């Protein structure tokens, strides 16, 4: 019904950013990662800053979005991607990651090391956690209980994330006494970054060209100017958990996430709180089911 002539799209036009803003406390909050055992980096001054820049550039992507001139997710994503790069310091070696898509060739591994370790027992305790054995040629056989995201695409279900976490504690503590005095620290630590009885192995980057493809469906459900309230948080909360859980870059995944279902809410006007003090959203995210998300996510949020 309305043409953007810059990006040459026809859309229907949204209200745009809440002219009521979140106050700046909660501002400072926007896109922190505040683990439950450790919200210690989001009081400081640098993580404050971070976190209200984002909240600024998440409104700018909404006013951007409401009047027609973001187009699809790819492109978002890649506002929430030059955001992300923009806060990284001089000399970053991860630069190159935080910019970069994740490809086939690799896989993808977060070992549940600091700051993860509130995830072990939410893996152990999880409703659908089942007891496997994996086979590892460091440790040998392990006792893991084993948490399997998985998705609903088009009547394919595909594997996301797989947790893992180790349950044998003290034979684990001897096992690595011997893999470190054999290997050294570091040298261990680095096969470690891969093979780390406690880990997340990450989607398979395969699945990304049809997880992009979908978000992009996502997206445009969610540009709609006739949806309801329920219809439209559902969206965002889908958009949210497609793509943290498909974690499509190599690095600022979880932050690029965040951004882009917080700027999909500004363009419709609503201002949403910070996600609650304990609640890591894109981890949030990766231990549930999508539906299990969608009915949930209100309740992660502070208010
Ligand atoms: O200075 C910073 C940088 C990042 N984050 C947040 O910490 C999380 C980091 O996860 P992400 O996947 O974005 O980054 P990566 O784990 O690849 O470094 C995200 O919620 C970020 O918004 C933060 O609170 N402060």
Redesign the pocket.
């Known amino acids: 019904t309305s043409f953007n002539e810059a990006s040459r799209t026809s859309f229907r036009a949204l209200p745009g950013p809440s002219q009521r803003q979140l106050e700046v406390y909660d501002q400072c909050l926007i896109?922190?990662?505040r683990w439950p055992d450790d919200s210690s980096?989001?009081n400081t001054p640098?993580?404050r800053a971070?976190?209200q820049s984002?909240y600024n550039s998440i409104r700018s992507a909404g006013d951007e979005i409401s009047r027609g001139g973001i187009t699809s997710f790819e492109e978002l994503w890649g506002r929430a991607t030059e955001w992300?790069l923009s806060?990284l310091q001089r000399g970053e070696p991860?630069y190159s990651?935080?910019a970069s898509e994740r490809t086939s060739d690799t896989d993808a591994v977060?070992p549940l090391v600091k700051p993860y370790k509130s995830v072990l027992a939410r893996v152990v305790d999880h409703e659908d956690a089942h007891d496997e054995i994996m086979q590892d040629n460091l440790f040998g056989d392990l006792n893991v209980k084993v948490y399997r995201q998985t998705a609903y695409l088009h009547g394919n279900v595909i594997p996301l994330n797989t947790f893992r976490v180790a349950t044998d504690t003290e034979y684990l503590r001897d096992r690595v006494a011997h893999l470190r005095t054999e290997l050294g620290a570091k040298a261990l630590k680095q096969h470690l970054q891969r093979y780390n009885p406690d880990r997340i192995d990450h989607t398979n980057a395969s699945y990304l060209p049809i997880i992009k493809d979908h978000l992009n469906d996502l997206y445009r459900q969610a540009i709609s100017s006739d949806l309801s309230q329920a219809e439209l948080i559902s969206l965002i909360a889908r958009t949210h958990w497609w793509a943290a859980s498909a974690?499509p870059?190599?690095?600022?995944?979880?932050?690029?996430?965040?951004?882009a279902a917080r700027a999909i809410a500004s363009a419709h006007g609503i201002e949403l709180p910070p996600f609650r003090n304990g609640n890591?959203?894109?981890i949030e995210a990766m231990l549930s089911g999508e539906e299990e998300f969608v009915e949930k996510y209100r309740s992660l949020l502070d208010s």
Do not use: H, I, P, W
Request: hydrophobic residues 40%; neutral net charge.
């Open positions: 896109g922190a990662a980096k989001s640098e993580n971070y976190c984002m992300r806060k991860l990651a935080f977060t974690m870059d190599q690095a600022g995944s979880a932050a690029k996430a965040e951004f890591v959203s894109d």
